[PDB]
Every structure is written in C-alpha cells, then in structure tokens.
C-alpha cells in the first residue's frame, strides 16, 4: 500500500525527486517549502519527466514545452497540457515521506 519514499530532509526545498516503481509508471515527489506532494512523473502531454522540470510554488513546469500542472490538484495550469495529472496523497510522519500506493 503506502510507499516509504524518503526522509523529509533528503529533499531540499523546491526540489523534485523521481520515484521509480517496478512494473508501474514512475512518480514525482515535490517538496514545496516544508510540504510534500506527488503525481505521476510523466507529463501527460508527452514523454517528458516532470522531475526534470521547474517548480514554481505549487506549479510544476514541464521541461519539454512549458506545459504545467498544479502539483496539488494535478489539473493543467498552462497549455499545451490538457489531460489532468494523476495525483497521490502524501503523508509525512516522523520525518519520513510516504506516498499513496494508487492514484487518489
């Protein structure tokens, strides 16, 4: 079920970490300030890795075409993205980052 991703301190504020999942699409864990969010890593508009994009507040900018999503709702924030990103609730307990097993 829940996936133990990393220690909260393993990520500096404003950074993104790609989480590979054997037999499944990779995820992207974002650290916005002292909060953590997670979505599918692959941009819904192509093959770009959002973990290699630019984080502006709660909005992740795709490195390929400048499309963007709100990492909290997964909804597109900038064109050309039109397909909502899969979102995974995140929980931080005892300084450890956990991400829901399935989109939700």
């Amino acid at each position: 079920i829940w996936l133990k991703v990393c220690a909260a301190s393993d990520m500096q504020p404003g950074t993104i970490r790609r989480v590979n999942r054997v037999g499944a699409a990779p995820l992207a864990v974002y650290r916005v300030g002292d909060q953590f969010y997670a979505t599918e890593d692959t941009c819904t508009h192509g093959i770009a890795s959002l973990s290699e994009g630019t984080l502006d507040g709660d909005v992740i900018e795709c490195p390929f075409h400048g499309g963007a999503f709100n990492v909290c709702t997964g909804m597109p924030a900038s064109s050309p993205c039109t397909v909502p990103l899969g979102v995974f609730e995140v929980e931080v307990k005892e300084g450890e980052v956990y991400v829901a097993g399935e989109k939700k």
Binding site: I47, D56, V59, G66, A68, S78, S79, P80, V83
Partner: protein
C-alpha cells in the same frame, strides 16, 4: 478573441465581437455538404472555421475527427489508412484513433506505448437533416440543431434541395450582402426577374422610426437568434430611379410578389420567403472556411405531401430553379461579395464605411451577432489553445 487590431476593436463599440469574429463563431452548427456526397467507408476532407476536418460514414452514421494527428501534426488525409471499420490509422507512425470518440486506442509502431488510451483526437458532432450534413464546430454537448437553423427549415413536409460551393470572401461580407435591403439593385437585370415575371423594386424609401425598420428575435422556442428586415412595412418601394430629376432606370413590374419576409439568423443563415416563386422558400448559409473564404450553401424548400410532389419538385429544381434562381439570380451576389474584400481586408473598412438608412438592417444584425454568438473562433483554436499560469 483578439483577431483584429485592438485600436480598431476599441472604435467599434457597437459590435466589437462581430468585427473580431474573422474566423466565424464557435459553438454553432454549420452545413458543409449534402448527405449524398459522403458514402459508407469513404472519408471526406474539408476545412471549417479554419480547422481541417475528416468526415466518415460508418454503418450509415456520420462521424467527424479533426484532420490532424496528435503526434507530429500531419493531416491523416495525406494517406488515409482505415484498417478496421471503426478506426483510422495515421500513415506516419500508425497512431490509431476511434471514429466514435477519437480515443487513441492503438499504435502499431509501439503497442507498449504509455500514450495508448491516454490521448484523444478532437471530435465534433455531426447530424444529417434534410439531406444536409451539419457539423457542430464547438465544445461540449451540442444544442438542438433547430437553434441554428431558420424557422421551418426542419418542417416535416419541407423538401430541401440545394447547391454548395466555395466563394472567395470572408463570411461576413456574404451575410451582410444577403441581408442588405438596398442591394436588390444589383439584381435588376437578373434573368429570374424577367423569366419568372417578378415584381422587383430598385430600392426603398424608409418610413417610420429606426426601431420599426427591423424585428429582432432574441429567443425562439428553440433559442434562435435573428433579425427580420421590415423596411417594406412602412417604406416606399422605388420603381423609378432618377438622377437630377430625370428617370434613368426602372424596377421590374412583374406580377409575382416574392420575398415578403427576409430574416438573417446566427450563425449566419438567411431565409427569404417566398422565393424564388410564391410557393417556395430559400435558406442559404455563408459558412466560414477560413478568413478569406466561405461555403455558399444554398437550399430551396417546398412543402411536399408525398413522393409524387417531391419527384415533381426535384424535376422543377434541376430544370428551372437551380439554373434560373440559385445561379441566374445569386451569381450577381457572388461578385458583389468579392468586390468588398479589399476595403475590409485590412479591417479598416469596419471604421471607414459610410452607411445610409437601409443599413439599419445590417447594424441590427451586427449587434445581434455580437450579443448572442456562442464564441469567437481564434487562430489559437486552430493551432492549439494557449494559456500560461
């Protein structure tokens, strides 16, 4: 939205949305061809509101997909590959889409692609009515076709026959010319006037107030939006054209009275009743293809009680009405539209035009169109909507 210089749009406060609508109004139904022009399993291409489209008939039903692959943007029609009854495969990298919903259901060049089932090619509703093919060039659930058609066009006993072609002028120049009360002057020498013994004045001397010059319909039982030209209600028909007091031209004194009522309706279709004969009606659309061209979709309707009358009507249409009216009368409208192209090409004619009394009809249409259109088609709709957070 944003198709014309902002300085020009700021000047035309009476109808800025209309002047901006170079490419037409989105979210309306538009006729583009006749049912008999598209057969089972034979995809057809066309351009509507600047968008390249593909229409196919599967099991008798019509489907419409945007003719542009999601991958590298090529037109699928360059080399059509319909490998299964319900799909079309792009000739480039084999991305395959379902005609029914446009879903990317397969990719022959990579059956394991993560894109499969995760993308959708744009689809548009298509409905056949009265032998005509209508496409809802819009987003979301479409309204009833009746909203975008003139009254009576969809009457059960109304038999519709027509002709369609591509004309080189912006759609608005076509609409305004058709609803122009004084443009009747260009028809003074039409063979229809003489051959069908029509009474045809050279113009009208307005009477009454400006409000009485037109009748705007803001809502029909089906949400129709249009304007009736009532210049003849209190106006005086002009049958003798004078210059310096001398008669230099005369209207036609035929006995057949036609065009008792003329109305224009969004998205841009004119209804002339009765025409070209007392027992018929004419419904014609000026469909936006791109900023410089439109489909001049002409139709003539006549109530027919049985197959017998429909047969006779069809014979009369082919032997007389099509050549004498649709062509013999309306051909002059075609070059008239083309004649206004230069003046409005730089969008400056919308400011420099000098209107006179009968143009109250055109002004009413411009305002109605500006206030009730369902959306302005932009170049961005064509290439891909843009928005930056």
């Amino acid at each position: 939205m944003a198709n014309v210089d902002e300085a020009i749009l700021k000047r035309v406060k009476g109808w800025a949305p209309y002047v901006d609508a170079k490419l037409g109004f989105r979210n309306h139904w538009y006729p583009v061809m006749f049912s008999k022009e598209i057969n089972e399993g034979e995809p057809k291409t066309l351009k509507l509101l600047g968008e390249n489209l593909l229409v196919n008939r599967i099991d008798g039903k019509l489907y419409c997909l945007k003719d542009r692959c999601l991958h590298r943007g090529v037109q699928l029609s360059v080399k059509v590959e319909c490998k299964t009854k319900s799909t079309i495969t792009c000739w480039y990298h084999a991305w395959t889409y379902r005609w029914e919903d446009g879903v990317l259901c397969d990719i022959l060049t990579n059956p394991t692609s993560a894109q499969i089932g995760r993308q959708k090619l744009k689809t548009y509703p298509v409905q056949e009515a009265k032998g005509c093919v209508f496409i809802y060039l819009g987003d979301g659930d479409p309204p009833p076709l009746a909203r975008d058609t003139p009254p009576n066009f969809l009457d059960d006993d109304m038999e519709i026959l027509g002709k369609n072609q591509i004309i080189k002028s912006n759609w608005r120049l076509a609409v305004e010319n058709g609803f122009d009360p004084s443009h009747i002057y260009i028809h003074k020498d039409s063979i229809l006037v003489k051959d069908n013994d029509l009474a045809l004045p050279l113009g009208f001397a307005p009477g009454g107030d400006r409000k009485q010059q037109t009748r705007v319909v803001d809502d029909d039982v089906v949400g129709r939006k249009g304007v009736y030209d009532l210049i003849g209600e209190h106006g005086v028909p002009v049958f003798e054209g004078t210059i310096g007091g001398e008669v230099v031209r005369e209207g036609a004194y035929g006995e057949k009275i036609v065009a008792n009522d003329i109305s224009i309706w969004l998205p841009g279709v004119l209804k002339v009743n009765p025409f070209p004969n007392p027992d018929m009606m004419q419904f014609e659309w000026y469909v936006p293809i791109d900023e410089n061209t439109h489909y001049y979709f002409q139709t003539l309707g006549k109530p027919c009680a049985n197959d017998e009358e429909r047969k006779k009507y069809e014979q009369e249409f082919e032997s007389k009405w099509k050549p004498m009216a649709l062509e013999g009368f309306n051909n002059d409208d075609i070059w008239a539209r083309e004649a206004m192209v230069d003046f409005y090409a730089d969008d400056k004619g919308w400011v420099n035009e000098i209107l006179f009394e009968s143009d109250e009809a055109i002004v009413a249409w411009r305002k109605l169109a500006s206030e009730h259109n369902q959306g302005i088609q932009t170049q961005a709709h064509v290439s891909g909507l843009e928005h930056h957070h």
